[PDB]
């Protein structure tokens, strides 16, 4: 019957990740309201994977059935339920040692073409050593489309590793690397021993 596959792992930051939104910060990152820990929103992961998969495929039926659709006539439930990637406990303890802040302020400027004057800017970024526990649920609505969809998920994740997550990652930011801790079918009889990401 219906199956749900729980992909859980780590999003290791490879370069300072800034997904824009405690006090006054110049371009602050998005944080958990309670713990005040920087987070990677699931809508940001979902949007970036959808954007990269849309470019790879070419909305397409493969993207619509994977990230959801609401168009007239063809309303497709989103199979990918990408939860918010919260700052891991392991990286919290690892950053507590070295007394390293979870986020760092990156200082830049913009040298004007007309006047050759540098106008400074600051964007807060999650520090490189950070790791976020990502929790994705894939709803197996079709037992025949699961292998093709998980191929697409691997392609979108591979593109995301070669790209940046939220922020001005064209200028360096946002680079990430996924690690899969386990892929276990929490609900249903479907098996995911053969299934894998990356």
């Amino acid at each position: 019957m219906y199956s749900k596959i729980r992909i859980v792992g780590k999003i290791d930051v490879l370069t300072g990740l800034h997904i824009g939104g405690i006090g006054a910060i110049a371009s602050p990152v998005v944080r958990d309201p309670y713990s005040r820990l920087p987070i990677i929103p699931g809508s940001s992961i979902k949007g970036k994977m959808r954007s990269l998969l849309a470019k790879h495929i070419g909305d397409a039926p493969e993207i619509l059935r994977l990230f959801g659709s609401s168009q007239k006539g063809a309303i497709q439930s989103s199979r990918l339920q990408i939860s918010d990637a919260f700052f891991s406990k392991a990286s919290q303890e690892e950053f507590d040692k070295k007394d390293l802040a979870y986020t760092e302020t990156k200082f830049e400027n913009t040298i004007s073409r007309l006047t050759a004057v540098a106008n400074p800017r600051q964007i807060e970024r999650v520090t490189r050593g950070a790791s976020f526990d990502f929790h994705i649920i894939y709803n197996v609505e079709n037992i025949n489309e699961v292998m093709a969809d998980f191929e697409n998920i691997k392609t979108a994740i591979h593109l995301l590793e070669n790209d940046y997550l939220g922020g001005g990652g064209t200028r360096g930011n946002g680079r990430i690397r996924f690690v899969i801790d386990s892929i276990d079918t929490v609900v249903g009889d479907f098996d995911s021993s053969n299934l894998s990401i990356k």
Binding site: G23, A24, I25, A26, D99, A101, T105, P120, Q122
Partner: peptide, 18 residues
């Protein structure tokens, strides 16, 4: 300012002796 002020806020947000 707007650079001493931001650095002041970061050092005021934590409770460390350092």
């Amino acid at each position: 300012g707007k650079s001493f002020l931001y650095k002041m806020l970061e050092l005021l947000r934590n409770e460390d002796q350092i």
